Each structure stands twice: as structure tokens, then as C-alpha cells.
Structure 1
Amino acid sequence: MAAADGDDSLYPIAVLIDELRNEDVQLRLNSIKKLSTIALALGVERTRSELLPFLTDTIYDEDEVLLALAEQLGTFTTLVGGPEYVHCLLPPLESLATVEETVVRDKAVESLRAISHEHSPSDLEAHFVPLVKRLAGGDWFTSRTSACGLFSVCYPRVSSAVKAELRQYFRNLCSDDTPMVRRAAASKLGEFAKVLELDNVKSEIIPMFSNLASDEQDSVRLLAVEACVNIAQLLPQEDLEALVMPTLRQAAEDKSWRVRYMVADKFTELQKAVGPEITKTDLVPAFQNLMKDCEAEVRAAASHKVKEFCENLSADCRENVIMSQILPCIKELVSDANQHVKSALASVIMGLSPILGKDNTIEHLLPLFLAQLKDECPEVRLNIISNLDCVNEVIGIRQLSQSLLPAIVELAEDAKWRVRLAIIEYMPLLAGQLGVEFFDEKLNSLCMAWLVDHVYAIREAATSNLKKLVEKFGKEWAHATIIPKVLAMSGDPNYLHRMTTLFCINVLSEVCGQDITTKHMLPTVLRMAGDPVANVRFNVAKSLQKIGPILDNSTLQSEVKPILEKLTQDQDVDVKYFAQEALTVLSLA
């Protein structure tokens, strides 16, 4: 039997409950994962009055089905009756918020934060808020560390009478005896302070934050200084010097390297969120100290922020600050012992070129760029080559050819192939800016030599570089310089270098034009169609398919069709497949 319209069904619920709390772990886990089709087959009435009280009282089994059920009930607002009945989901989830396993209570607090907005202020102050009080007052740490994440989702939509209750409750959660929940409180410090009124973020959030920032365990001090960014985003620049700054000054020169690393990693975030004048007064010596730190991780984190910090200084003093206080520490950092520090500094150092000025980067920055170019570590070398376009824009192209071009030509054949790849990827800019005469005399040899590199990735990069050089200089220059050597590679006794000819023809038919690709490149492919290696043969088929749309139909029918037909009758299967596919795509068979 069926219903008139009501979701209510005569479906036996026994055969449904005979799988949720029955069978092995996998079957009941799948039933809980699918606990939504059964809620639709039962109906809103029967789901609220016959399946939810079920799940409320069945404290059973391992944490996997518990996690699945929490995630499922996170989306059960409509299946129980809408915003009117969501309060029936709060009991089961509450039990899931006290579970020992972290993932279960985390999914539970996620589901609670999701359905928190589905309540009205009456339902919040009548069902959710008491649930928060119950969870944050439990005997075990799991309930408290899970309840620490319920304050921000129900604080703004409740009355002005439970505000002090919840505030002092969160304060009690901060002054907890176990560090486990103290860590979560320090984490949610900022998240709860952003939803608080200004009259409360400076009278009760600031003392709590300072207390957490001077705790016995650095493990919570690091989260305190992390939430400092969100906290200082609320107080005006007049109160900071009295409320946020005293904790920051001691956190900068703290005994533990972890909170110092957190200070250095969020240094520019603080710089922007707290103000520019005070950074001129306070944060510049702090940066000088962090870049001269005894720990190496802190030095690396500080060097990573050099560029974005220096370009975010005040506009008037910047030229004096970076030259008289920041640049000496940078000169010290290039000769560091730790390779991570040097690499992180080289990854951002060239960004200081437009801030300093052409003469300043020539006199003060170019020797350091050179030194990092001749560095022994490959990562710092790659990072310093990465940002060469910035330097080339600041200084002159002629000046770059005078100072840094020999180093680039040397790194063109570096031991590690990714440095060579960086040089190849910077080749088109250098060619376009230096001109075809200088390129043909100097840099053409490197671009043609990369085509027979041992690493295949370098050969692919050179293949693409050929097309880019054509896009820079012209298909006429391509026919004059590039095409002869590319076709000469067709006689290499190594099939790996022989397929590079086909790859070059493929990438060059897009830019050389129908005439050039018909009179110079097509004969080479059609001759290579009889190569002994099957790889070269199916690559000939693929290359013909690639270059097809560039020739006129007479050439496809007169010279390409017989070659593809003869390749379809080869002994290898892959060459036959590719020749037949080329015939089909080119619309020839």
C-alpha cells in the first residue's frame, strides 16, 4: 500500500533496522553511508519519530560508522521537517561530539556548525546553547576541545544576556588544566574574537590572548601568536601599542624557535594588518633580528619574506631603510651555511630590483645575483634564474648582457637538467630583446645543441623553443637557420634524436606556413616513413596527421595518401594503427 501524498510509507522499518545495528562492519557502514534513501523511504514523520530516536540511543560499535553518521546527519535538516525540527538532530550529534577519536568529534563539530544557522534564535538559546554548555563542561577533554568550536556559530544570533555567559564560558575553556583543549581554545581565539563586539575584544579578548601568549608550553604560544594576526586586525592603531605590541615584542625574541618561526612566517601578514608606521618603529629591528637568528628554519622563513616586506615599507623611508638596515643582512644571508636559507632568499631576492633602482641593483645587487648563480646547490641556482625577467626590466638589456649573460651561457649546460630547462625557458625573451644578429652569433648554438641533449625533457624544451624563436624572428629566418639542421638530424644513428626531427616539424608547421612546410619539411617526413625503427615510423604517421591541415588537398592526395597506405601495411601493429588513424583524421580513407 502507498500514501495519498505524504512521504509516510508502509515500508517495514524492521527490515531497515535489521541492517543498521546488525551484520558486519562493512554492511552496516554502507547502510549508514546510505542513511538517506531509508530516510526518504520512511518519510519525514517516520524519520523524525522512528529512525532518529533509533540513532539517538544506539551507542554502538567503532568510530568509522560514527564518523559516517555524523557526516550524514550534517545534511538532515530537510529530512526531519525543516528549520522547525532540526532540534531533534542535536542529541545524537552531541554524543558524537564526545567521541574520543579526533576525526569523529571533528566531523561532529562540523555538522553542528553547519546546522547552527538552521535554528532560530529561540531554538539556539533553547537547544543549541545548552548543548554548548553541556559539551564544554564535560569531564573528558574531547567534549571540551570539540565544544571550543561552537561559540562563533551561535554567538551573534543570540540575546545580549547569554553573551557574558558564553564569554566567561570560553574564558574558563581557556584557563583549562589540560593543554589539549587549551590548544583548541588558542586556535579558535581569533575565530571567536572576530564575531565579538569592539567593547569586548579589548576588555576580555586581549587579556586572554596575552595569557595564552605567555603560557608555559610554546605549543600553545605559537597558536596565540597565530591568532594575533586576526586579533590586531580589530584594534585601531592607537590601542595596538598598548594591547598587542607588548606580547609581540616578547614573542619576537622568545626562547622557543617554534613561536619565533610562527612570528617570521606571519611577519608580512602582521605588517599589513597592524600598520606601517609601527613597522618603521618596531618591526624593522625585529626583521633584522629574525634574519640573524640562531635557528636556521627561522632564518629561512625570514628570508622568504624579504621581498614582500621591503616593498610594503613606507614610501618615503624605504630607500634608506632597505639600503642601511636590510641590505647588510641580505649580504650576510647569501653566504649562509644552510642551503634552505640561501634558496629561500634567492627565490625572492631579485624582486628587490625595481624597489632599489637600476644603479642600486647594479652596484649592490648584481654581484649577489652572480654569486647565487655560481652557487654549488642546484635549488638556489634554479631559484635565482627563475626571476631574471624582473632584473632585465629594471636594468638594461645591454647591462644584463654585460653582467649576467656569461653566467646564463654557462648554466645553459648545467649538470642538473632543470637549470638547463630554466635557461631554455628564458631563451625566447633574450632572443627577442637582443636581436637576430646577436642571437645568430651567440645564443643560436645553445638552442641547437639542446636538441641532442641526453635528457628527453631538454629536447622537448628545445623543440618548443624552436617554435618560440620562429615566432620571434620570422618564418624566413626559420627557413634560413633552423630548418637545415633540424632536417640534418634525420640521419642520426639514434632513433631518439631522429624522432626529434619529427617533433620539430610538428611544432614548426604551425608557424612556418604551407609553402615552407611543403617544400622543406614534408619531403623529410615522407623519406623518414621508411625508417627501420618502428617508433620513427608511427611518429611519421602521427606527424603527417599533425601537419595535414597545413597542406592543400592535391598534396594530401598525391603524396601523403600513398605513404599512409603503405604504412598501414607494415609489420608492426602500432604503425598500422597510427597510419590508419591518420588516414581517418585527415579524411583520406
Structure 2
Amino acid sequence: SLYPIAVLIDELRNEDVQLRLNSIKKLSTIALALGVERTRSELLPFLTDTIYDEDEVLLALAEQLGTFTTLVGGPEYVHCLLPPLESLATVEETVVRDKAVESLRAISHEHSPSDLEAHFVPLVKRLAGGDWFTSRTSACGLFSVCYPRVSSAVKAELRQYFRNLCSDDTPMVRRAAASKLGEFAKVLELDNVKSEIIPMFSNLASDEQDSVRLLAVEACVNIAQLLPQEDLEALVMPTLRQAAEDKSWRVRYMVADKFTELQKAVGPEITKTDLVPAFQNLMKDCEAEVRAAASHKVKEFCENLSADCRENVIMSQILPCIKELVSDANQHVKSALASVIMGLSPILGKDNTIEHLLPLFLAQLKDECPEVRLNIISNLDCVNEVIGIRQLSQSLLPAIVELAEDAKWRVRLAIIEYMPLLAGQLGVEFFDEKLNSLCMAWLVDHVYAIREAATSNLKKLVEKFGKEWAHATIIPKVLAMSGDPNYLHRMTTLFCINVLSEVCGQDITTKHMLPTVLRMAGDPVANVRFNVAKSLQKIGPILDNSTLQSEVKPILEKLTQDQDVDVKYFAQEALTVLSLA
């Protein structure tokens, strides 16, 4: 019974990457078969340093090594897994190093505090003090998991070691330290956070490398979430103000991208005093990316403002900046604004929305960019309950008409998908009065994808508006295409009947579309004929058994005698599926 285990063990030396990978992923079976002491003394030394350096093999090995706590002899001997993971935490591949660090953190919880101070802490010190910055980068991620469960002297040593990493010469080590600064500070005492974490945060935030400075914004958020509100101004606020006006556009982009988190962390008073001018300057930034990032946060930032003076601030400070953003030259800035500007109506109120937001909506609805118009249309639900869609339909209809007849068929496809929501919001009467012709004209479009999308949209519309409206308006119109000289439109009629059978009910299907389907079985084009066969197969369950045995079965039988092979095959398949014969 040991033969498969012997095969797996010898597969670790195989030159084939796939076989060696498969053997790696079954290391649990090998360890279980070998035992415990044999696993510790034979398998682990072999897996300590592997000559093969394939990224996926090393990644799989790193994943497996984090679950061998029981297979090596329980938590008592968990320190035996340290060498293989320490070797993996040094390789050049970033994902392998991250997986090794994650496994080390996962198995660190099984260490007793004595084992933590005897084996894990020396490992962290060796990694932090190593000659290769790949080791030092990995060491930054292991401070938070061993700090809470050590003595005071070990805590001071760990703090000193982390302080040394933040002043490293290699930019990657400093980047890792900046990344892990917040999660490290989350476990220190508040006094030590003020005394030691703040100087490191200030030093990293004023680093020469732009890639290091932009990582201080997340650290800023994490540190602000810890300190008391009265201590924010003296410690965190100057760094945040410096970051908001930083020379590099990447740092300003990071500030704008995490602006709502900063607003939540610092509180309402600091938000009103300092963050509002920062947002005003960010929306007027000279970089298009920064303006686009700040545009996304307009709605949330306005929502989270203090209710004491929310409307006044929005009117006197944010609204002019928004007005300047509507006329922006960058397409992406306008696209980003259009998707969030539409929801400021509930905050401002009906009269304020009519006076101020309505001109902005009208101006953005006439933009040359299709995506701006699509974004404005897609979010009408925010204002639908504030001012009503009656005040908006007169300007929405021209925009919908323009989008529905765009030269690019993908724009027409995009506007189609929003029609059921638009029809639901605008009401059935307005749809029948204005939008019915647009929907019908899509079924005869040259592009087949548009016809398919219009068919699915018609199914959604009938689902929304019920069967009676469909039978009254659409069904008499869709069956008119059966007389189209082009066979593509006839097959479109078949497809529309296919999707409408599931919703229109058995009675309507039998009385209105079944006679049309049966009449088209005599179409000269074989494509229409076997499409009729497939349609009869599909809508077969909806029809009654009496109708199936009376009129459907003879029609299917006649199709089985057709000259075309495809028609015969599809008719036979329909007969087999319906079990008529």
C-alpha cells in the first residue's frame, strides 16, 4: 500500500514541473504516511532549501507549510517549520514572499510565549538584520503577530528593530515599513504610539521617494483612528496637510482616493475646518487623475458632513467647484462626476435641486461623450423620489433618442440594457407614447447583437409591465415582421416568440403566437423552417397536450419529410424532446 507514497516522494525530484507541483500539493499525504518524527527529521530538512525555483511550485510549497502544525507533532514542535519558511521568505518573487509571511503569521499563533521568545523572535531579528533586503522586506510583516505576547524588554527590542527598518537605505524596505506601520501601531500602547510611532510616521511621510510618501496616507488613516480627537491636531493633522499639498501627483491622488476614510477618522469638526478646503483644492487640481479621483468621492463626502451646516457648506463651497467640473476638458473626469453628481438631490432638497442641480443635469445630458450620458441616465433613481421624473422627461427623451440611434452599435447596445429601468421609472403611459417606437426599431437593426439585446429587453419589459399590456401593444407589432422579405427578421420574430412564451402565459401563447409559428413552417428558406422546429421544441411545455397532439405533432411530422438535412434533424430532435412520437 506504500507504492503511491513512494511514487509521490520520488516525484519531488522529477524534472517535470507539473508532476513536481502535483507532488507538492499532496505533501500532507506524504507527511501522514511517513509519521511525525520522520516528517521532522527527513521531510523538513529536504524541503528546507529547494534547488528548484519555479514561482508556482514555491507558492504551493509556501501554502502547504502553513498547515503542517499537526503533522510535525502539534504545537510543541511547531518551531521546526521555521527554517523552510525562512528560506522561502527570502526569494525574489513577491507573491512567494507574501505567502511565506502569511504562513509564518498563521503558525505564529501556535507558539507558546516561551517558544515565541526563543525561536520566533530570533527569526524576526535575523530577517530584519539580514544582508539581503528581500529578507528585510519580509520581516516588516511579522512584528504585529509577536508583539502582544512577549515581555517588555522584547517589546522594546522589537520597537527598536522596527525603527531601524523605517530608516533603511533600500526603498523597498521603507515601502514595506510604511505599509505595515498602521497594523504595527494598532498593537502598541497609546503612549508608545505617541512617542515612537508618530516620529516614524512623520519621517516616512517626508521621504524622498514618491512611492514611499504615498503609502503614508493609509498610515495616516490608521493612526488617526487610534489617537484621541484632541490629539489629532498636534500629531496627525500637519502631516495630512503636507500630504494634501504634496508636489507629487501620486500622493495627492492617494489623498483624494482615501478622502472619505480620512473624513470618518478625523471627525466632523476637523473635516469642516481643514478637510473642506483640501477637497476644494483637490477638485481644482492640475492633474486629471486627481480630479477624477476626487470626483468619485463628492457624494460620500457631502453625505458624511455634519448635519448642522451640511447644506450651507455644499451650496457655498462645493457647488461652484462641481459646476466647474461639469465643463471639464477631460472625458474621464466628466464620466466620473456624472455617476455620483446625480445623487446629491436628497441632501439638497427639492427646491435646491430644481434651482441648482437641474441645470447641471441638463448640461451633462447634452455632452458629446456617450459614457457621460449613459452615467447620467443610469442613476435617475436617486432623484426620482425627490422632484419626480415629470420635470426630467422633457430633457431625457431627446437624450434617449440620440443614444438609441448612435452610429456605433455598442452604444446602442449599452442604452438598450437601461431601457427596462427607464421604462419602469418613466411609467407605462410615457413608454407607450414615446419609447415604444425606439424599442420596435431595434428589432430590425442590421447588427444581430442589437436584435438579440432588444429581444431580451422586450422580455424584461413584458415581465415588468405584465402580460395584458404586451398582448395589447407589442404582440400585434412583433408578428408583423413575419412578412418581412428578409429571412433574418423572420428568425428574429421566431426568437421574440421564443422569449415571450415563458411570460405571456399558455392562453396568449396558444391564441396569438402559436398560429403564427405554425404558419411559418412553410417558409421557403430552410433556416426559418428549422428555427420554427426549434421554437416548437422550446415552447412545447407551455402548450397544452391537446394542442400538441392536434396541430403541433402533424406540423413536426411534416418537417421530418423536408429535403434539408438540418430541418429533418431538428424536427426529429423536437419530436424526441416533446415525446410526441
Q: Structure 2 length normalisation: TM-score?
A: 0.93
Secondary structure at 1:99 match in 2:
coil
Q: Cα gap change, 1:453/1:95 in structure 2, threshold over 3 Å: closer, same or farther?
A: same
Which of 353-362 and 436-445 deviates more?
436-445
Check conservation: 1:233, 1:274, Cα contact below 8 A.
yes
Q: Cα gap change, 1:97/1:498 in structure 2, threshold over 3 Å: closer, same or farther?
A: same
CA distance in 1, matches of 2:423, 2:19: 66
Check conservation: 2:9, 2:23, Cα contact below 8 A.
no
Check conservation: 1:347, 1:387, Cα contact below 8 A.
yes
**The one of 401, 406, 411 aligned to 1:409:** 401
Q: Cα gap change, 1:231/1:541 in structure 2, threshold over 3 Å: closer, same or farther?
A: farther
Check conservation: 2:217, 2:255, Cα contact below 8 A.
yes
Shift of 1:155: 1.9
Which of 329-338 and 425-434 deviates more?
425-434
Q: Deviations over 1:243-289 (max 9, x none)?
A: 11110001001111000000000011111122122111111110100
Shift of 1:562: 1.8
Q: Cα gap change, 1:17/1:460 in structure 2, threshold over 3 Å: closer, same or farther?
A: closer
Secondary structure at 2:27 match in 1:
coil
Shift of 1:447: 1.8
CA distance in 2, matches of 1:556, 1:18: 65
Counting aligned pairs with the same residue, the percent is 100
Shift of 1:468: 4.0
CA distance in 2, matches of 1:388, 1:18: 65
Shift of 1:170: 0.7
Aligned to 2:17: 25
Shift of 1:340: 1.0
Check conservation: 1:531, 1:537, Cα contact below 8 A.
yes
Q: Cα gap change, 1:410/1:69 in structure 2, threshold over 3 Å: closer, same or farther?
A: closer
Which of 535-544 and 445-454 deviates more?
535-544
- Structure 1: which 5+ residue stretches go unaligned? 1-8
Shift of 1:437: 4.7
Which of 235-244 and 191-200 deviates more?
191-200
Which of 324-333 and 60-69 deviates more?
60-69
Shift of 1:532: 3.6
Q: Cα gap change, 1:588/1:572 in structure 2, threshold over 3 Å: closer, same or farther?
A: same
Q: Cα gap change, 1:523/1:77 in structure 2, threshold over 3 Å: closer, same or farther?
A: same
Q: Cα gap change, 1:438/1:220 in structure 2, threshold over 3 Å: closer, same or farther?
A: closer
Shift of 1:11: 8.5
Which of 60-69 and 534-543 deviates more?
60-69
**The one of 510, 520, 527 aligned to 2:512:** 520
Check conservation: 2:89, 2:135, Cα contact below 8 A.
yes
Which of 10-19 and 325-334 deviates more?
10-19
CA distance in 2, matches of 1:256, 1:136: 30
Q: Deviations over 1:505-528 (max 9, x none)?
A: 122223333222212100111122
Which of 299-308 and 36-45 deviates more?
36-45
Which of 120-129 and 262-271 deviates more?
120-129
Q: Structure 1 length normalisation: TM-score?
A: 0.91
CA distance in 2, matches of 1:560, 1:67: 60
Q: Cα gap change, 1:567/1:161 in structure 2, threshold over 3 Å: closer, same or farther?
A: farther
Which of 244-253 and 204-213 deviates more?
204-213
CA distance in 1, matches of 2:7, 2:401: 77
Secondary structure at 1:204 match in 2:
helix
Check conservation: 1:385, 1:423, Cα contact below 8 A.
no
- Structure 2: which 5+ residue stretches go unaligned? none
Shift of 1:350: 0.4
CA distance in 1, matches of 2:65, 2:239: 42
Q: Cα gap change, 1:175/1:473 in structure 2, threshold over 3 Å: closer, same or farther?
A: closer
Secondary structure at 2:2 match in 1:
coil
Secondary structure at 1:394 match in 2:
coil
Check conservation: 1:32, 1:65, Cα contact below 8 A.
yes
CA distance in 2, matches of 1:29, 1:515: 60
Aligned to 2:120: 128
Check conservation: 1:116, 1:153, Cα contact below 8 A.
yes
Check conservation: 2:559, 2:568, Cα contact below 8 A.
yes
Secondary structure at 2:215 match in 1:
helix
Which of 299-308 and 187-196 deviates more?
187-196
Count of matched residue pairs = 581
CA distance in 1, matches of 2:325, 2:7: 71
Shift of 1:38: 2.4
CA distance in 2, matches of 1:400, 1:99: 61
Q: Deviations over 1:465-522 (max 9, x none)?
A: 3334444555344333211221111122333322221222122223333222212100
Note if 1:457 corresponds to 2:449.
Answer: yes
Shift of 1:142: 0.9
**The one of 374, 389, 392 aligned to 2:366:** 374
Secondary structure at 1:239 match in 2:
helix
CA distance in 2, matches of 1:518, 1:234: 69
Which of 34-43 and 206-215 deviates more?
34-43
Check conservation: 2:366, 2:373, Cα contact below 8 A.
yes
CA distance in 2, matches of 1:401, 1:545: 42
**The one of 382, 390, 399 aligned to 1:398:** 390
Check conservation: 2:471, 2:508, Cα contact below 8 A.
yes
Secondary structure at 1:150 match in 2:
helix
Check conservation: 1:495, 1:536, Cα contact below 8 A.
yes
Q: Cα gap change, 1:272/1:456 in structure 2, threshold over 3 Å: closer, same or farther?
A: farther
Check conservation: 1:265, 1:302, Cα contact below 8 A.
yes
Shift of 1:537: 2.9
Q: Deviations over 1:342-382 (max 9, x none)?
A: 11111211011222222222222222222222212222222
